[PDB]
Amino acid sequence: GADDVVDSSKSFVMENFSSYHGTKPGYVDSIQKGIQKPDDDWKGFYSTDNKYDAAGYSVDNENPLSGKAGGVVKVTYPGLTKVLALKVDNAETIKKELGLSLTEPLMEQVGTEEFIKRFGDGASRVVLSLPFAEGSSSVEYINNWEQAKALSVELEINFETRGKRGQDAMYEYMAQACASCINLDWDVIRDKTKTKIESLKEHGPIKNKMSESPNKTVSEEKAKQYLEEFHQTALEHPELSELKTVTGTNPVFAGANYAAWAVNVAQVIDSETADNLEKTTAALSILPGIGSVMGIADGAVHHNTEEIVAQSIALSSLMVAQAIPLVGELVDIGFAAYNFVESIINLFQVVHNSYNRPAYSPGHKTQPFLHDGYAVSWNTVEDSIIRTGFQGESGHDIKITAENTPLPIAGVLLPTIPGKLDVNKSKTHISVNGRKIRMRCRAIDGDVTFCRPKSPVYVGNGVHANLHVAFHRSSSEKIHSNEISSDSIGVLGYQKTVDHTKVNSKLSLFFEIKS
Amino acid sequence: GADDVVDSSKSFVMENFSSYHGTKPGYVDSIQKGIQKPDDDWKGFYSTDNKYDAAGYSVDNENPLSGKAGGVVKVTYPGLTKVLALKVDNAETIKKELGLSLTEPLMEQVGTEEFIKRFGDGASRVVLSLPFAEGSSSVEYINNWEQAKALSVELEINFETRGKRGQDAMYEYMAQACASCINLDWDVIRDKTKTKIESLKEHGPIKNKMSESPNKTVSEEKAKQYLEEFHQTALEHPELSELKTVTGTNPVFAGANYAAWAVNVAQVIDSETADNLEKTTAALSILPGIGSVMGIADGAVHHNTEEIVAQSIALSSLMVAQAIPLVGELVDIGFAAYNFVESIINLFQVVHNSYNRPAYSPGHKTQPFLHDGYAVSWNTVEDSIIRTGFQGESGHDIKITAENTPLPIAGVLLPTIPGKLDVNKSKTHISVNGRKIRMRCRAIDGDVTFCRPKSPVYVGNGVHANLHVAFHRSSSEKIHSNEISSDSIGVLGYQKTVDHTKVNSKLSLFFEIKS
Ligand SMILES: NC(=O)c1ccc[n+]([C@@H]2O[C@H](COP(=O)([O-])OP(=O)(O)OC[C@H]3O[C@@H](n4cnc5c(N)ncnc54)[C@H](O)[C@@H]3O)[C@@H](O)[C@H]2O)c1
Ligand SMILES: NC(=O)c1ccc[n+]([C@@H]2O[C@H](COP(=O)([O-])OP(=O)(O)OC[C@H]3O[C@@H](n4cnc5c(N)ncnc54)[C@H](O)[C@@H]3O)[C@@H](O)[C@H]2O)c1
């Protein structure tokens, strides 16, 4: 009953149990006067244990994208509060398993004396606990509206009082979460951006380059052509010197990408959109290629300095202005320097926040490694863990497929500890659409066993494989932090005779040793 | 104990319990005389319930790729046999949970009187049952060597007696599994191939085109250039007319791809490799681009006629011959018409076998939909099922990420049955690296609700999202086969103002209604 829906390991009675609530502009002051009710099973006051998670619930409901953020308040229950952690979020299952009345709203029942007597363990009330979200270690608290009347409300922060532009106050606060960490000063970036734009517009070669602008609707291919030369010319400016160095190698940061982005923007911004930050943001947010200007690629935010960020934004701003008359419909005039910059700043902040949050990189846990047309991932989280300290076997499933045409899997490289952790050659195989292919595994240079499929393996649209790696433990001795050669399994795809040195496509699955 | 490792639902006592075993050339006749033993926990005789799965175990152990296939025999146990289905393949877990001696080999213990008395349910012996493989509905039987001595062995098929070339006899037999079904006559294809090659070599314009071959080591870029013109010229031949029509539209079947493939082959075939079928096959099997010649793309085998397959193979054969002197190292002479054709035929057969086997297409069950840089999939099989016939809620997790740079998720389109099956707007959200974004969902034209994220959603390397769709059932009435608008959920990525008509990247997740 209660075992099916309640997580005892994670429930607890606490004195002065505190949590956080994010609220909208206009209510930061009135909410500190008291919590009050402004499916039914879930009608309740919502808080979280994470204040920066609370912050995300503070944006003006009618302008969720660019709107103003209100604040975060701390709500404390005096006395003893019982946090009942739930293993399911289906209310009928909860009411049933907890033997509750299958009719009255779950939350309504949570605030009854009987319910508090039964699962409160002496606490004055009960607050439901649920995981905040997939990919979050935060929890979500669900307070019964009546019991919530006992909450003491204190202010955490009022983003509006910080008097900063856009959602700068909210994002810089959340950034406090990680003290890597992208902790940028947007006031500094906002100011450098304006200065740079100014210096660029008022610039000999740039103004000269502008002269040659067809300054009339031209074809898209000609637009990009002009834009790529403009970009090249603009990057010579002393103000964009660092950006010239940082964007020199990675192809994602090339001029063609800036030009591509610039024309794409100029194309979707009509006059009414441009005269609205919310409308600009919604328009820009669905465009591809924003990574070229943000300097984000290969899993890293490369433009992580106020100086380089401001040069990148100033650069695309100038180009959007050039692109508007060639492939647009409005007066680039303000847009490029006004809402374009305001909207893009906001988007950077959204993406920087994502990378500041703890997340699994490709090939880790059940997160896919996408590369060369292939998609590989550990079938389950348990699969990605190699347990140690016992004599025995273990199996590990790795899912494999390719996007379209049939691509080969040459085999798989596995890290070992010869004697302690070995490949179990008889249980290691790969099934392609069910055809269980046996593998010829051989120890190679450097504590790695290379296993090859006995027959050809190809994956693609409609064709998938399950790589089942079996390992053998010769002793109970725990593998130690030096023992295994590496922390990944390497699935090898096709062979490319590139760099005059033939090599395979490598698809890595990262593991952790435990127990 | 036994509940933890034994699947009662799938175990049974059967009279004359039969199964199949695939064996190597040289043993098809001697194995019919009796089963006899030629980790330890798993030492046993191996059979399966699928004869075409058995067939795959018949290839000459020293030439697993191109070698000769022996046969399949049927092994029958007289009397009553108890098939004990196992829920785990870890022998220590089995011996422990079944209270067996944790020392003696599991299989050794399976052939004891005591063990047969305990779990045989009166049957003369016990055979272990295990799922054959991930992606297979077949089972694997594990016979105790001693008890296996009672088996009656009958012949199913001897591929060698069929007297066909390569592994034609084995693959055409397996093809019998699906009676779509690629059931090709390789003798016919082999014969048409030779005829076509002949007609091409002895052909005015082709011979003329050959004349102009630099016929000496030229650069790779020049090689492809010559090869693309040669290809174009060769496709005009009356013998390759159908192939000219079938390869006209899909870019994967273009001449650049044939030329690319041709030079890639010529590049990896040295003399010793070329004089060995096993070595040729192993060499070719790791090359990319085989889908252009097989005519396989977008999840379908397009070249599915003996006529069109033979034209495709004849065409690449001619080109490999041209590519050898330009970007190779041997005498194209025999290779292109000898082992090249033998090896490629084998590879086609491997891939056709994959597509003949039941498999889940992208976006179905936990199989990923890969498109436009995004990777999306149902978190679990249960998620991909929408259950009906009850009043209540259900949640469905969809995993989302993109390969590299930050790409947007505009929102998600969901099929409904207004009144009966609705979107639960309060529980439907998307978490990006943990940031739980709420969604504005609105009913639109045609029994579809479009939900948009309240704030910008971008995914890419290091950034992932979990789309959690919540549905609401207003009555116990079962959704019927006409009710829901479609069988998929459509996640929308970036917007491309292509075809002068702007559209989003569409990523579909296919579901099934059940219960
Ligand atoms: N806002 C949060 O901190 C928070 C925390 C965890 C989860 N959530 C999630 O967000 C969704 C909606 O929750 P929500 O709280 O933003 O919205 P809600 O739908 O409950 O609306 C209540 C809104 O009115 C405001 N309000 C103003 N004065 C109040 C007062 N005196 N007492 C109580 N509320 C007052 C709240 O701040 C909130 O913005 C939830 O269903 C849950 O998924 C929100
Ligand atoms: N061959 C099959 O039909 C079959 C079926 C299901 C699973 N498997 C799998 O293939 C792996 C190895 O099994 P396997 O059977 O190919 O190889 P094995 O390692 O048990 O080797 C025995 C080989 O010797 C042969 N043999 C010849 N005469 C025999 C005789 N008189 N009695 C018994 N065996 C005789 C068998 O045909 C087989 O080819 C298994 O571990 C399992 O994963 C094989």
What does this molecule look like?
Two copies of one chain form a homodimer. With 515 residues, the first copy, chain A, is α+β, with helices and mostly antiparallel strands. The first copy, chain A, folds into three domains: 1-179, Diphtheria Toxin, domain 1 (Alpha-Beta Complex), CATH 3.90.175.10; 180-359, Diphtheria toxin, translocation domain (Globin-like), CATH 1.10.490.40; 360-513, Immunoglobulin-like (Sandwich), CATH 2.60.40. Helix content of chain A is 30%, strand content 27%. In chain A, the strands form five sheets. In chain A, strands 9, 10, 12, 14, 15, 16, 17, 18, 20, 21 and 22 form an eleven-stranded antiparallel sheet that branches. In chain A, strands 1, 2, 3, 4, 5 and 6 form a six-stranded mixed sheet that branches. In chain A, strands 7-8 form a two-stranded antiparallel sheet. In chain A, a hairpin with a 3-residue loop joins β17 (435-444) and β18 (448-453). In chain A, α8 packs antiparallel against α9 (220-234) and α9 (220-234) runs antiparallel to α15 (306-327). The longest helix of chain A has 22 residues, at 306-327. Bound molecules: nicotinamide-adenine-dinucleotide (2 copies). One nicotinamide-adenine-dinucleotide (NAD) binds at residues 21-24, 27, 30-31, 34-36, 38, 45-48, 54, 57, 140 of chain B. Chains A, B: Homodimer. Chains A, B: Disulfide bonds join 178-181, 441-451. Chains A, B: The record marks 145 as: Modification inactivates enzyme. Chains A, B: GO terms for molecular function: identical protein binding; NAD+-diphthamide ADP-ribosyltransferase activity; nucleotidyltransferase activity; protein transmembrane transporter activity; toxin activity.
